[PDB]
Amino acid sequence: SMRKKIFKPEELRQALMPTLEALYRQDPESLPFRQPVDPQLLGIPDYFDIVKNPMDLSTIKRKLDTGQYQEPWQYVDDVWLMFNNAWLYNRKTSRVYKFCSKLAEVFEQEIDPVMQSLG
Numbered sequence: 001s002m003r004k005k006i007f008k009p010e011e012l013r014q015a016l017m018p019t020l021e022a023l024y025r026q027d028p029e030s031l032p033f034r035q036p037v038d039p040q041l042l043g044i045p046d047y048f049d050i051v052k053n054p055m056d057l058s059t060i061k062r063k064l065d066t067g068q069y070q071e072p073w074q075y076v077d078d079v080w081l082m083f084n085n086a087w088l089y090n091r092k093t094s095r096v097y098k099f100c101s102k103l104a105e106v107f108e109q110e111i112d113p114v115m116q117s118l119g
């Protein structure tokens with residue numbers, strides 16, 4: 001027999017929220033990731049020329065809360081997209097690039113026992 005696994009919106013929320021809460025918990029590391037990057041406020045005019053698909057924690061939280069996700073990999077893709085954007089835009093020696101690498105480290109430690117328990 002062949003089939004694809006179905007997931008309820010509240011089932012996705014309860015299983016994936018600790019991994020997101022773990023990212024939020026990182027202070028000062030998560031502070032630049034909590035809200036969408038605002039180039040005008042940050043004095044980075046070329047941001048949208050480089051980062052074509054912006055992602056942040058508030059969007060991922062709003063999606064997971066309002067049931068905008070269907071599969072667990074959709075959540076993981078969004079989180080990795082947010083990390084990829086900060087690594088692409090920022091210098092390797094910069095505060096945001098280092099904070100990003102720390103968040104990715106926490107996320108890989110948190111998502112591993114969660115995705116294994118999901119299937």
Ligand SMILES: COc1cc(-c2ccc3c(c2)nc(CCc2ccccc2)n3CCN2CCOCC2)cccc1=O
Nearest residue numbers: 028031032033035037038041042044085086089090096
């Ligand atoms: C994730 O990628 C980037 C992030 C940021 C970034 C975004 C928001 C930031 C921030 C940097 N620095 C601060 C100040 C808070 C803070 C303090 C001590 C350490 C880290 C953050 N916040 C929060 C407040 N801000 C004030 C201005 O309008 C917006 C809200 C800049 C550069 C490149 C990026 O691509």
